[PDB]
Amino acid sequence: HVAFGSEDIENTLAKMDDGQLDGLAFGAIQLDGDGNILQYNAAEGDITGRDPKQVIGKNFFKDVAPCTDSPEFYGKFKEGVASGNLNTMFEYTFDYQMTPTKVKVHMKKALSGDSYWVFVKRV
Numbered sequence: 001h002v003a004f005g006s007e008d009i010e011n012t013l014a015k016m017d018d019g020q021l022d023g024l025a026f027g028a029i030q031l032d033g034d035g036n037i038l039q040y041n042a043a044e045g046d047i048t049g050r051d052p053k054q055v056i057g058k059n060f061f062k063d064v065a066p067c068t069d070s071p072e073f074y075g076k077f078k079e080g081v082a083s084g085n086l087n088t089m090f091e092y093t094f095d096y097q098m099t100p101t102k103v104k105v106h107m108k109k110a111l112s113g114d115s116y117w118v119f120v121k122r123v
């Protein structure tokens with residue numbers, strides 16, 4: 001088990017494969033520094049209606065999730081990528097190619113130093 005917002009969430013998830021990530025209680029997306037989707041779990045697809053198997057490789061901010069292209073989400077992502085001190089939490093509404101859905105979001109640098117987690121749960 002691992003809870004949304006856990007202080008060491010990035011440690012726990014670093015040890016996980018696809019199946020384990022698919023079993024999480026919350027949506028989990030891993031992005032590279034450019035916002036390309038590296039991983040996308042089953043729980044996230046349950047929130048958004050995206051097929052996880054097919055969004056891999058797409059750009060989260062340009063193509064998949066344009067409603068997050070804003071200072072409030074994408075702006076915070078780029079600030080944290082640039083600082084090396086991505087770890088930030090906030091509320092948001094997802095409303096592109098889905099019923100508007102209120103969520104809470106947590107972004108955090110992965111240990112694969114290279115990538116960046118985006119965590120989502122319904123509120």
Ligand SMILES: *C(=O)/C=C/c1ccc(O)cc1
Pocket residue numbers: 029044045048050064065066067068093094095096
């Ligand atoms: C806004 O358009 C948000 C879209 C979105 C958020 C999260 C996802 O996993 C997929 C699309």
